[PDB]
Design a protein around this ligand. Structure first.
Ligand SMILES: *[C@@H](C)[C@H]1/C(=C/c2[nH]c(/C=C3N=C(/C=C4/NC(=O)C(CC)=C4C)C(C)=C\3CCC(=O)O)c(CCC(=O)O)c2C)NC(=O)[C@@H]1C
Length: 172
């Protein structure tokens, strides 16, 4: 599982030629670890083996990956902003998209990317059946919109990967 996933990130980056792409796995307690990472000329630092507090991932957003498998972050420069409301959303995700061709992310996560030298990142999750196992993410330091065609093939690759983690799991 740890070996396969490492190989998966190597070919993936090559296909997108993105500066950095890493695979992230979700643990039952909310914590996750970086088990796969590729660097575009050591441009970005290696976060391999580092743990990211679960508190970093709320809940409403995580459900959307499990329910709709669709989320991307736009040009931090375009200044697209997201905000919460007196009320909280949950199962409401049962709705398919229903938003402009773009998705805004609150300013908190936005600068975090800026602080990381990232301006636009594509997000694709890894899931099996009704369960979400991890989160894939590509980092683009400069504006780079995604194509509807390439997006699926990858979404499929992720799905193909999500399937691998499932099939490999039985082994252990
Ligand atoms: C800011 C951190 C506040 C917040 C808002 C917020 N952030 C997200 C969700 C994400 N955070 C990501 C983090 C990264 N980058 C990594 O390197 C890494 C560890 C390997 C991850 C997973 C990130 C790109 C996401 C999306 C993935 C996910 O499913 O969470 C969101 C959701 C997006 C949306 O607009 O719905 C927002 C708005 N969360 C807080 O509690 C902070 C106060």
């Amino acid at each position: 599982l740890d070996q396969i996933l490492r190989a998966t990130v190597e070919e993936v980056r090559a296909f997108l030629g993105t500066d950095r792409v890493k695979v992230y796995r979700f643990d039952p307690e909310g914590h996750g670890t970086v088990v796969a990472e590729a660097r575009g000329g050591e441009r970005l630092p290696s976060l391999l083996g580092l743990t990211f507090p679960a508190g970093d991932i709320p809940e409403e957003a995580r459900r959307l990956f499990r329910l709709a498998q669709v989320r991307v972050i736009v040009d931090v420069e375009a200044q697209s902003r997201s905000i919460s409301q007196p009320e909280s959303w949950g199962l409401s995700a049962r709705v398919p998209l229903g938003e402009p061709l773009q998705r805004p992310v609150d300013p908190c996560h936005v600068h975090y990317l800026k602080s990381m030298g990232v301006a636009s990142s594509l997000v694709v999750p890894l899931m099996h059946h009704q369960e979400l196992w991890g989160l894939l993410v590509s980092h683009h330091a400069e504006p780079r919109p995604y194509s509807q065609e390439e997006l699926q093939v990858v979404q499929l690759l992720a799905d193909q990967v999500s399937i691998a983690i499932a099939q490999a799991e039985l082994s252990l």
